[PDB]
Design an enzyme around this catalytic site. Structure first.
Site, PDB file in Angstrom:
ATOM      1  N   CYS A 108      96.607   1.613-116.842  1.00 38.24           N
ATOM      2  CA  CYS A 108      96.858   0.363-117.581  1.00 38.24           C
ATOM      3  C   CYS A 108      95.192  -0.223-118.009  1.00 38.24           C
ATOM      4  CB  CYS A 108      97.654  -0.480-116.989  1.00 38.24           C
ATOM      5  SG  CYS A 108      98.079  -1.866-118.174  1.00 38.24           S
ATOM      6  N   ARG A 111      95.210  -4.750-117.842  1.00 37.66           N
ATOM      7  CA  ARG A 111      95.205  -5.421-116.409  1.00 37.66           C
ATOM      8  C   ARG A 111      94.593  -6.753-116.546  1.00 37.66           C
ATOM      9  NH1 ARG A 111      94.436  -0.881-112.227  1.00 37.66           N
ATOM     10  NH2 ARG A 111      93.097  -0.081-113.817  1.00 37.66           N
ATOM     11  N   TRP A 280     102.135  -5.991-124.469  1.00 41.16           N
ATOM     12  CA  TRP A 280     101.864  -5.797-126.212  1.00 41.16           C
ATOM     13  C   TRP A 280     100.942  -4.580-126.576  1.00 41.16           C
ATOM     14  CZ3 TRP A 280     100.691 -10.697-123.925  1.00 41.16           C
ATOM     15  CH2 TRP A 280      99.216 -10.703-123.378  1.00 41.16           C
ATOM     16  N   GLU A 285      97.684   3.054-129.703  1.00 41.28           N
ATOM     17  CA  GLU A 285      98.796   3.366-129.083  1.00 41.28           C
ATOM     18  C   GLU A 285      99.915   4.196-130.340  1.00 41.28           C
ATOM     19  OE1 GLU A 285     100.479   1.596-125.406  1.00 41.28           O
ATOM     20  OE2 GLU A 285      99.515  -0.074-126.281  1.00 41.28           O
TER      21      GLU A 285
HETATM   22  C1  HEM Z   1      99.836  -7.164-122.018  1.00 41.10           C
HETATM   23  C2  HEM Z   1      99.394  -6.002-122.529  1.00 41.10           C
HETATM   24  C3  HEM Z   1      99.228  -4.801-122.143  1.00 41.10           C
HETATM   25  C4  HEM Z   1      98.470  -3.773-122.825  1.00 41.10           C
HETATM   26  C5  HEM Z   1      97.691  -3.965-124.018  1.00 41.10           C
HETATM   27  C6  HEM Z   1      98.616  -2.990-122.063  1.00 41.10           C
HETATM   28  C7  HEM Z   1      97.972  -1.467-122.342  1.00 41.10           C
HETATM   29  C8  HEM Z   1      98.410  -0.225-121.889  1.00 41.10           C
HETATM   30  C9  HEM Z   1      98.071   1.011-122.607  1.00 41.10           C
HETATM   31  C10 HEM Z   1      97.449   1.207-123.950  1.00 41.10           C
HETATM   32  C11 HEM Z   1      98.734   2.075-121.567  1.00 41.10           C
HETATM   33  C12 HEM Z   1      98.710   3.340-121.891  1.00 41.10           C
HETATM   34  C13 HEM Z   1      99.913   3.863-122.841  1.00 41.10           C
HETATM   35  C14 HEM Z   1     100.135   5.228-123.214  1.00 41.10           C
HETATM   36  O1  HEM Z   1      99.026   6.002-123.255  1.00 41.10           O
HETATM   37  O2  HEM Z   1     101.222   5.721-123.191  1.00 41.10           O
HETATM   38  C15 HEM Z   1      99.266   1.417-120.593  1.00 41.10           C
HETATM   39  C16 HEM Z   1      99.949   2.075-119.511  1.00 41.10           C
HETATM   40  C17 HEM Z   1     100.414   1.418-118.409  1.00 41.10           C
HETATM   41  N1  HEM Z   1     100.665  -0.053-118.289  1.00 41.10           N
HETATM   42 FE1  HEM Z   1      99.888  -1.206-119.463  1.00 41.10          FE
HETATM   43  N2  HEM Z   1      99.508  -2.900-121.011  1.00 41.10           N
HETATM   44  C18 HEM Z   1     100.003  -4.049-121.137  1.00 41.10           C
HETATM   45  C19 HEM Z   1     100.994  -4.822-120.088  1.00 41.10           C
HETATM   46  C20 HEM Z   1     101.457  -3.879-119.045  1.00 41.10           C
HETATM   47  C21 HEM Z   1     102.406  -4.712-118.224  1.00 41.10           C
HETATM   48  C22 HEM Z   1     103.107  -5.851-118.727  1.00 41.10           C
HETATM   49  C23 HEM Z   1     102.816  -3.671-117.154  1.00 41.10           C
HETATM   50  C24 HEM Z   1     103.446  -3.958-116.291  1.00 41.10           C
HETATM   51  C25 HEM Z   1     104.026  -5.163-115.422  1.00 41.10           C
HETATM   52  C26 HEM Z   1     101.744  -2.583-117.512  1.00 41.10           C
HETATM   53  C27 HEM Z   1     101.960  -1.407-116.807  1.00 41.10           C
HETATM   54  C28 HEM Z   1     101.462  -0.237-117.027  1.00 41.10           C
HETATM   55  C29 HEM Z   1     101.624   1.005-116.606  1.00 41.10           C
HETATM   56  C30 HEM Z   1     102.384   1.341-115.200  1.00 41.10           C
HETATM   57  C31 HEM Z   1     101.174   1.822-117.168  1.00 41.10           C
HETATM   58  C32 HEM Z   1     101.017   3.735-117.306  1.00 41.10           C
HETATM   59  C33 HEM Z   1     102.682   3.851-118.049  1.00 41.10           C
HETATM   60  C34 HEM Z   1     102.626   5.739-118.149  1.00 41.10           C
HETATM   61  O3  HEM Z   1     102.140   6.155-117.232  1.00 41.10           O
HETATM   62  O4  HEM Z   1     103.120   6.085-119.105  1.00 41.10           O
HETATM   63  N3  HEM Z   1     101.087  -2.707-118.671  1.00 41.10           N
HETATM   64  N4  HEM Z   1      99.062  -0.037-120.648  1.00 41.10           N
HETATM   65  N1  LIG Z   2     100.905  -1.578-123.975  1.00 39.54           N
HETATM   66  C1  LIG Z   2     101.710  -0.974-123.363  1.00 39.54           C
HETATM   67  N2  LIG Z   2     102.375  -1.724-122.436  1.00 39.54           N
HETATM   68  O1  LIG Z   2     102.657  -3.003-122.680  1.00 39.54           O
HETATM   69  N3  LIG Z   2     102.072   0.252-123.613  1.00 39.54           N
HETATM   70  C2  LIG Z   2     103.225   1.017-123.157  1.00 39.54           C
HETATM   71  C3  LIG Z   2     103.270   2.366-123.637  1.00 39.54           C
HETATM   72  C4  LIG Z   2     103.587   2.274-125.054  1.00 39.54           C
HETATM   73  C5  LIG Z   2     103.497   3.885-125.775  1.00 39.54           C
HETATM   74  N4  LIG Z   2     102.127   4.199-125.783  1.00 39.54           N
HETATM   75  C6  LIG Z   2     103.907   3.738-127.225  1.00 39.54           C
HETATM   76  O2  LIG Z   2     102.899   3.984-128.206  1.00 39.54           O
HETATM   77  O3  LIG Z   2     105.025   3.386-127.324  1.00 39.54           O
END
Ligand code: HEM
Ligand SMILES: N=C(NO)NCCC[C@H](N)C(=O)O
Ligand code: HEM
Ligand SMILES: C[C@H](O)[C@H](O)[C@H]1CNc2nc(N)[nH]c(=O)c2N1
Ligand SMILES: C[C@H](O)[C@H](O)[C@H]1CNc2nc(N)[nH]c(=O)c2N1
Ligand SMILES: N=C(NO)NCCC[C@H](N)C(=O)O
Ligand SMILES: [Zn+2]
Lengths: 410, 407
Positions: A108, A111, A280, A285
Site C-alpha cells: 500500500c 500508508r 480513496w 489504478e
Molecule cells: C487512503 C487512501 C489509500 C490509497 C490512495 C491507497 C492506495 C493503494 C494502492 C494504489 C494499492 C495497490 C492497488 C492495486 O494495485 O490493486 C493499495 C493496496 C493496498 N492497500 Fe491501500 N490505499 C489507501 C487506503 C487503504 C486502507 C484504508 C487500507 C486498509 C485499512 C489499505 C490497505 C491496502 C492493502 C492491504 C493493499 C494490498 C491489496 C492487494 O494485495 O490487492 N489501503 N493501496
Molecule cells: N486505493 C485503494 N484502496 O483505498 N485501492 C484498492 C484496490 C483497488 C483496485 N486497484 C481498483 O482499481 O479497483
C-alpha cells in the site's frame, strides 16, 4: 543486525532494524528471489504466543508495558484461550490492530494515512442481512458525498473454520463481467466468474457495460445471500477529458469508492475473514490498470483512434500517448465532481515522506517495490529510485482463497 | 523444488528448474526480500572450472566423453601447477555468450547467441587496449547498423596486475561542477570527469563532451586517449512535430557500451571486458534525460510545450516524458541508427523467456530492472512473474578502480 536502504536520487541512506521483528516467511530463499510473484483453524498452542506478542506491542504502544493492567490482560487472555480455545479483543485492541495491519501493508502506497481510520465493529453480526446493513453503513460513511473517509468494517472472527463470515465480492462495489458466446466480454473481464455465480444465485443481470454487482454475503458459515446496494449510495463519476470533447462519448465512468473485501485481517493470532476496507483511489489504478490492462476494459485502441495517432508502428508510442490522456481524464473528472482522488506523483511523494518518518520513529517500513511503483511513468516518481525492504509484520492483511472454492453448500 | 511462474495477462504458466542449478546467493532470505536493492585458491578454482567445463561439454553433446575427461584433467593439472588456467577460444566464446544469457537484468537477451567476441588476452599495454577498443567501437557501430560485441582483456592473476577500463561506458559525456553550484553536462560522471582532469585531460567544459578513455594494463597506472571522433556516432535529437525541440540542443551517442563490469567464466575473472549491443529508447529518453540526477530536462520541454505545470495532477510531467521519448526514437530511426522501443523490446523478451523455459528449464530475470521506466503495465513483462537467481558464467559489478588502485 542493521540493514541499509539507499535512495539513488538523493543519496539519502536509511537504517532498518524493524525487520528484526519479522516472523512470517517471504517466499524468497538465499538462492532465489520471488519478489515479483503475485502470491508465493489454529491450536491453543500457537495461539497464546501470537496473542502475547500482540498485547506486548499494544501495551508498549500506549506506554503501559509491564503495568498491572498489561499483566492482568495477558492472564485474562491466557485463561480465556485455555478455557474456550480462543479469545475476544477489546474494542481498543481491535482499532489498534486494524490500524497496524494497514501500517504494515507493504503493497500500500497510501500508508501516510494509516493512523486516520474509522473502525466499524461488526463483531455482533450474525446474519447475511445483518452484514448487508453494516456494509451499507460503511459505504455511506466512507463515501461522504465525495469527500472520502478511510474505513474498515470487521465481522466476527473465524472459530472452527466451519462458521466463517465472508464477503464473496472482491470489492464491495465493482462492475459485472459477461462472457459472450462469440468469445468477447461485456463489462469487466476481471469479474466474469463472480458474475456467473451471482446470476446462478438468482441475480437478474441487466447485462450492461457498467452494472454494479450485487453483494453476495456469507454469515456464520451459511450459504451466501444476494443483496443489492441502494443505488443512491453508489457514487460514480462519468469520465470526460478537459480538452477532448469526444472523450465523454466513449461512455466511460467508474465508482469512486475502492473497497477491497476479500482479504483476511490477522490480529494477535485471530483471523477476521470478512473485513472490507476502503480509502480513496490513486488515479492510475483506474486509468492505467482497470481501463488499459489488456485483460480489463482495454480501451487503448479506441482512445488512440479518436486521437488519430499513428498506430502503424509501436515506436510512435501511440499507446503511451493515449495512456497519459486517459489518466488525465480520470483525474480531471473526479476533481471536477469533487470526489477524492490522488495522482501518482502526489501519492508517491507522500509515501517517501511517510517512509522516511517511519524509519526514524519506528526503525523501518516494509515495502513492496514491485507494487509501490506506479504502472506508468515509473522513474519520474520518487519511489522508483528508492531501495525498499519487504518483510511481513503482524497484524496484517492476507490473501485467502476465493470462498466458492472452499465453501461447503448446505 | 520445482517453481512455477505465471503471466497474469495470458494465464500462461511456466515451470522453472534451472534455478536448481543456482550456486551464488541472492541477498534475500526467508524473512526479508532485497529485490529492489541496486547491489545486495586452487581449491576454490577447480570446482568452478569443473562446473564450467561440464556444462560446456554438455552443450556440445560430448558430456562424459574422453575429450571431456581429458580436458578436465588438463585444466586440473594446470591449476595445480600454475594456480590458474587458460580457456580455449571455444570455451571463452561460449562463456561470454552465456554470461549474457545469464544476465538477469538484461531485457535484450533474445539476442544472446549473436555476440562477436574479440579475444584481447594477448594485450599487454594501455596503448594496446586503446587499439582493441577503437576496433570494437568501429565494428559494433557499423555505420549505424549496430552489432553486439565484447572485447575480453587478460584475466586477473595476483590482483596486482589487473586490466581495467576506468570509464563506466566506452562512450559517455563529462560532467563538471560549476560556480552556480549547478552541474554542467552529465552529473553521473562528475567524479570521473574530474579524475581525467586530475590526470591531464583538457575538458572543453561543454554539455555533451565525449570523455577520454582511461586505460589500465597489468596494474600499471591508467592512461588517457581520445576516441577518434570519427568513430563516435552521435544522433542529434529532434521531434517529428515540435520544430522547437532541436533548440533544446540535445543529442546522444549511439553505442551503449558498459565497460566497468567483471566477467567470470569457470572461476576466472576478467576485470576488463567492455560489451555493447544497442539502445532501448527509454534508457536515454526516460533515464538519461529525465532522471532528476541526470540531464533532468522535463521542465524545459514542459515549458516549451506550454502546459499547466502548476498542478501535478495535470500530468504535465507525464505528457512531456512521452514526447521526449518519441523524439529520441524518431531521431535515431531518422539517422538510421539501431534502437528498440520498450514495447518491441519487452515483447521480444517474453518470447525469449518462453524459448528459455522450454529449452533450458528457465530464465533468471530481475523484474525490477526488466520492466521499463515508463508505461510499465502496458508492456507484457509487467504482468509476467519472474524468478531472479544467479548463474555462472556471469557479469558482476566491481569496485571503481580509483578506490583500489595503488599509484
Ligand atoms: C487512503 C487512501 C489509500 C490509497 C490512495 C491507497 C492506495 C493503494 C494502492 C494504489 C494499492 C495497490 C492497488 C492495486 O494495485 O490493486 C493499495 C493496496 C493496498 N492497500 Fe491501500 N490505499 C489507501 C487506503 C487503504 C486502507 C484504508 C487500507 C486498509 C485499512 C489499505 C490497505 C491496502 C492493502 C492491504 C493493499 C494490498 C491489496 C492487494 O494485495 O490487492 N489501503 N493501496
Ligand atoms: N486505493 C485503494 N484502496 O483505498 N485501492 C484498492 C484496490 C483497488 C483496485 N486497484 C481498483 O482499481 O479497483
Ligand atoms: C542487443 C541489444 C541489447 C539490448 C536492447 C539490451 C538492453 C538492456 C537494458 C535495457 C538494460 C538496462 C540498462 C540500465 O538500466 O542501465 C541492460 C542491462 C544489461 N545488459 Fe543488455 N542489452 C543488449 C545487449 C547486451 C549485451 C551485448 C550484453 C552482454 C554481452 C548485455 C548485458 C547486460 C548486462 C550485464 C546488463 C546489466 C548491467 C547493469 O547491471 O548495470 N546487454 N541491457
Ligand atoms: C507479475 C507481477 O507481480 C504483477 O503483474 C504485479 C506487478 N505490480 C503490481 N503493482 C500494483 N500496484 N498492483 C498489481 O496488481 C501489480 N501486479
Ligand atoms: C532503487 C531501485 O532498485 C533502482 O532505482 C532501480 C530500479 N529499476 C531499474 N531498472 C533498470 N533497467 N535500470 C536501473 O538503473 C534501475 N534502477
Ligand atoms: N542497452 C544497453 N546495452 O546494450 N544498455 C547498457 C547500459 C546503458 C545505460 N542504461 C545508458 O542509458 O547509457
Ligand atoms: Zn527477494
Amino acid at each position: 543486525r542493521f540493514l541499509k536502504v539507499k535512495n539513488w536520487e538523493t543519496d539519502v541512506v536509511l537504517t532498518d532494524t524493524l525487520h528484526l521483528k519479522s516472523t512470517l516467511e517471504t517466499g524468497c530463499t538465499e538462492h532465489i528471489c520471488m519478489g515479483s510473484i503475485m502470491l508465493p483453524v489454529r491450536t491453543k498452542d500457537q495461539l497464546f504466543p501470537l496473542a502475547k506478542e500482540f498485547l506486548d506491542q499494544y501495551y508498549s504502544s500506549i506506554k503501559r508495558f509491564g503495568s498491572k493492567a498489561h499483566m492482568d490482560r495477558l492472564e485474562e487472555v491466557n485463561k480465556e484461550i485455555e478455557s474456550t480455545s480462543t479469545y475476544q479483543l477489546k474494542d481498543t485492541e481491535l482499532i489498534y490492530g486494524a490500524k497496524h495491519a494497514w501500517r504494515n501493508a507493504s503493497r500500500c502506497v497510501g500508508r501516510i494515512q494509516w493512523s486516520k481510520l474509522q473502525v466499524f465493529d461488526a463483531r455482533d453480526c450474525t446474519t447475511a442481512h445483518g452484514m448487508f446493513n453494516y456494509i451499507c453503513n460503511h459505504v455511506k460513511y466512507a463515501t461522504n458525498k465525495g469527500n472520502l473517509r478511510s474505513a474498515i468494517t470487521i465481522f466476527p472472527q473465524r472459530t472452527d473454520g466451519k462458521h466463517d463470515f465472508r464477503v464473496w465480492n472482491s470489492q464491495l462495489i465493482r462492475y459485472a463481467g459477461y462472457k459472450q458466446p462469440d468469445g468477447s466480454t461485456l463489462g469487466d473481464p476481471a469479474n466474469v466468474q463472480f458474475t456467473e455465480i451471482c446470476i446462478q444465485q438468482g441475480w437478474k443481470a441487466p447485462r450492461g457495460r457498467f452494472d454494479v454487482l450485487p453483494l453476495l454475503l456469507q454469515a456464520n458459515g451459511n450459504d451466501p445471500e444476494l443483496f443489492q446496494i441502494p443505488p443512491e449510495l453508489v457514487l460514480e463519476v462519468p469520465i470526460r477529458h478537459p480538452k477532448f470533447d469526444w472523450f465523454k462519448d466513449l461512455g466511460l465512468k467508474w465508482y469512486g469508492l475502492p473497497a477491497v473485501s476479500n482479504m483476511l485481517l490477522e490480529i494477535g493470532g485471530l483471523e477476521f475473514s470478512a473485513c472490507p476496507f476502503s480509502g480513496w483511489y490513486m488515479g492510475t489504478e483506474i486509468g492505467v490498470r482497470d481501463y488499459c490492462d489488456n485483460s480489463r476494459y482495454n480501451i487503448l485502441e479506441e482512445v488512440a483512434k479518436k486521437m488519430d495517432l499513428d498506430m502503424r508502428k509501436t515506436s510512435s508510442l501511440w499507446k503511451d500517448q493515449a495512456l497519459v490522456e486517459i489518466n488525465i481524464a480520470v483525474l480531471y473528472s473526479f476533481q471536477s465532481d469533487k470526489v477524492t482522488i490522488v495522482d501518482h506523483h502526489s501519492a508517491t511523494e507522500s509515501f517517501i515522506k511517510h517512509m522516511e518518518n517511519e524509519y526514524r520513529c519506528r526503525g523501518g517500513c516494509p515495502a513492496d517495490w514491485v507494487w509501490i511503483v506506479p504502472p506508468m511513468s515509473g522513474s519520474i516518481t520518487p519511489v522508483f529510485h528508492q531501495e525498499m525492504l519487504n518483510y511481513r509484520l503482524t497484524p496484517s492483511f492476507e490473501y485467502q482463497p476465493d470462498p466458492w472454492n472452499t465453501h461447503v453448500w448446505k
